[PDB]
Design a protein around this ligand. Sequence first.
Ligand SMILES: [Mg+2]
Ligand SMILES: [Mg+2]
Ligand SMILES: [Mg+2]
Ligand SMILES: [Mg+2]
Ligand SMILES: [Mg+2]
Ligand SMILES: [Mg+2]
Ligand SMILES: [Mg+2]
Ligand SMILES: [Mg+2]
Ligand SMILES: [Mg+2]
Ligand SMILES: [Zn+2]
Ligand SMILES: [Zn+2]
Lengths: 29, 103, 135, 77, 97, 91, 244
Amino acid sequence: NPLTHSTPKNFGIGQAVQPKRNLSRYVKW
Amino acid sequence: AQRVTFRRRNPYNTRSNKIKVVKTPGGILRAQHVKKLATRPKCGDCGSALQGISTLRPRQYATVSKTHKTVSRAYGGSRCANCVKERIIRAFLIEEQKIVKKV
Amino acid sequence: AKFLKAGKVAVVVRGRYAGKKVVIVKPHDEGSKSHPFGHALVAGIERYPLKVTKKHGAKKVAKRTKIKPFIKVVNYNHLLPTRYTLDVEAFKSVVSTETFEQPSQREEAKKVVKKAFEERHQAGKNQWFFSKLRF
Amino acid sequence: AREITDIKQFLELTRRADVKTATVKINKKLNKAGKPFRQTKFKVRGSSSLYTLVINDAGKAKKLIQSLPPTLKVNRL
Amino acid sequence: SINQKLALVIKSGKYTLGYKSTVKSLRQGKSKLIIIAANTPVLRKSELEYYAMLSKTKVYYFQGGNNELGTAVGKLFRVGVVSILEAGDSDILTTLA
Amino acid sequence: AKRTKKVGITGKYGVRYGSSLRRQVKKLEIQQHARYDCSFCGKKTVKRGAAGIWTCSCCKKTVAGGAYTVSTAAAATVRSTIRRLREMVEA
Amino acid sequence: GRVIRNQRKGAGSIFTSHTRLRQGAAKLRTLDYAERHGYIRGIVKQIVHDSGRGAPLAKVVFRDPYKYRLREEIFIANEGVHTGQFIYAGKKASLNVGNVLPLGSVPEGTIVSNVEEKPGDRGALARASGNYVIIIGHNPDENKTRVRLPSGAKKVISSDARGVIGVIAGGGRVDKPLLKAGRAFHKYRLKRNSWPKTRGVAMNPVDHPHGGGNHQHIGKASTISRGAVSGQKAGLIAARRTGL
RNA sequence: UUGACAUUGUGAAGUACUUAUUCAAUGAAGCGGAGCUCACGUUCUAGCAUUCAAGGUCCCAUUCGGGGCUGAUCCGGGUU
RNA sequence: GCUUGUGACGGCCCGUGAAAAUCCACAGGAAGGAAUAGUUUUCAUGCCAGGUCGUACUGAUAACCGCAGCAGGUCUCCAAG
RNA sequence: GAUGGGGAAGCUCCGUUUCAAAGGCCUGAUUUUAUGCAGGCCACCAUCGAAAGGGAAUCCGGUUAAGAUUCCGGAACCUGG
Ligand SMILES: [Mg+2]
Ligand SMILES: [Mg+2]
Ligand SMILES: [Mg+2]
Ligand SMILES: [Mg+2]
Ligand SMILES: [Mg+2]
Ligand SMILES: [Mg+2]
Ligand SMILES: [Mg+2]
Ligand SMILES: [Mg+2]
Ligand SMILES: [Mg+2]
Ligand SMILES: [Zn+2]
Ligand SMILES: [Zn+2]
């Protein structure tokens, strides 16, 4: 517990890189 | 007074066809093809040369040890000492401002 | 008015340890027989502890929390003072002017600081001191 | 191509399990202002480089001649 | 007006001109006021503020470049930062200046 | 000593191209090869490279400017106009 | 007769553009989520010179929002833009020189350059040195904006079209006389094969509709109608008026 | 270049919509509606930003680890 | 001194004077690792192999092109008193 | 200059990343046998184009009626394993 920290990432514009999301709506079929 | 000739097949005075005149142990003058001079590595932040790094051809860096291609500091063979100094000063002062700007 | 005390924390700017955080132990404001300039005796971190999560095993946590210390004399102009502090009363005796200029005594002082620094990392405190500066 | 100035490291190269030939060369050379002397160049033919040891005094040079292993073919002059 | 005040400090007080000398005074705690030119680089300007924050030293931002700040001190060369070691007959340490 | 009466730098062209044309180039050549004070370090070491590129010799700062001047008159008016607009748009 | 000179340029054998030393196509950043809902900060790494273009070029590096990478863009530098300056592009970007904003989010009278004819074409208007577009009003309904072009023509564009604040650098270039044919030779050497130009009246009737005759003269009216065909459009094309 | 006919459908009054057709971009990323709290994370500085994300919660059968939800709100698959 | 190589500089441009293969370093810390033992083949030394095609001579008032053993034409390096 | 496509009665024309489901080396899994199968990496998307451009590595001495930095003797270097 003392060695583990909560470090949330900012996913706003210009902040940390976006994570993997579901892009099924934009798939080039 | 003795005149020399090209030793390769190229008869044209190109960049890769430069010669130097030397005196052989046999007592005669003979042309000697030389290689193009190497260029010192340059810093990626200011463009200046880097100390402690050998000046070799690009493919000649694979036959030397790592000691000849870097120094014992962070960003050793990439950035010079002053540029690394500026990064640390910039990094520390800006991150302290982020805490201040939070409140 | 004075901040270069025996507990201040600074950042090394030159000489194989640039960007690594150290704590001042024995400052020397007015020169010395060697180093005829303002300097101080510091102990710092060369390899910072790695990040530990809840999924790491028992033995893997111990490996990732190893700390490699170093002891060096640094000029004042080659340091960047910070606003943080760290108590050095545990390992003040081992580091001194006699500690240097003796390879055997340099090694013995390092293992004392390593034990002191590591036990501080457990039961987390001075978290800014044990985080690697990014640059 | 390579010159060694230590007699101790010359002996170990002489028994490196790959050297098969050696040669000794005598040079009649003049000193800076003294009488002419003679120097001996002990050369060992390695698998990659030729090693040379230069001995200027004749007394020490004569001692090193019999120290060579008998299994090494030495070409005199 | 601080330009008239700076002249009195020159003939009656102690001052140091230059970035390196100013930093040395701040570390020693001998400084009491630092004057920063307008065209000072922000990275250098930020470092001086941090040094003054640790030593509890007031900071004044000069309204002009190093050409103008150097002229106020009375020198013929560009001056980046001026540190006031101790004022003489002037009252620059007790005013807004 | 003063070598030329009025041609100045345009003496390289001799008697060719006409006096009126030579006079016009003279005004734009002195400005092109002039020294300018850097606004980032205060030193008078700014000189033109290619047309529109102005770089300081000491701090190596490159600023985009006019063809033969570090700052044209129309660019100056834009900065004043932009400054005025940005003061009433954030208020 | 034969095929006249201006007809031969369409084939494009020796009349193509010399693009060996070009630094790239100067275009704005691709319109993405960040541009229309915020802003992204860029860095002016260096200002370079492009062959055949009077206006200097600025290289601005951005961060890819979706992958750990760095993207470089080639912009047309405006006046006052310097290396190391931060550039903000997007709807929420502040009104500063060198920033790229949609035309519908700026007050009237703003000076802009590298304007987009349509949202997403990455800059079409006011790209030459010293030219700029003046915004003369807005239209909140049906999302339109009125602008003034350097030629003096009023155009109506959508409010989502983008543009950079300022004036294209390198102005005043056309004020210095070339003073000789050598400098004109090197000027077009980096652009295309269109110099020198031979007068039609000095040719033969086979070569141009102006050549021939015992005196060097045109012979017919030089005002050619818009309805003429290829080989006839030599001279003044659809001239509303002539003279000084 | 101009008119007629075909491509060529839908609605209203004295121009409106979409599906044909046409134009443009993107290695088709955040579109439309609604719900949380006009907005709803980023502007002194030429630094840094990547390991299905740390943390929180719930499982495996505890071995070095593995897997859901949340973190990062739903609905419609119309890439814009 | 002559020829040539190179270094630091200066002048000129509305002219700013190629590209790719290939090699290297750094940031990063994913994994692998010591007590009766492992890794380093970027340190030294030792072992094996390197296929295919071109290679003679002229290069010109006689070996090239001009009907020819034609005073023409034809790219370039070395240069003594 | 092919392929995917679009023209042309047709020989063939356009086009080189274009309205395309366009591709493979780092391993783990298996000790039935060789490669099917588990996460991840990657999307640049033919090819041809310089014996004066870019470019891994050799020099001296001797030797023929006619060949050599290629042969001989000695002394080196580079690449791959
Ligand atoms: Mg004629
Ligand atoms: Mg005609
Ligand atoms: Mg006619
Ligand atoms: Mg031959
Ligand atoms: Mg013949
Ligand atoms: Mg084709
Ligand atoms: Mg090829
Ligand atoms: Mg070549
Ligand atoms: Mg021969
Ligand atoms: Zn540097
Ligand atoms: Zn400057």
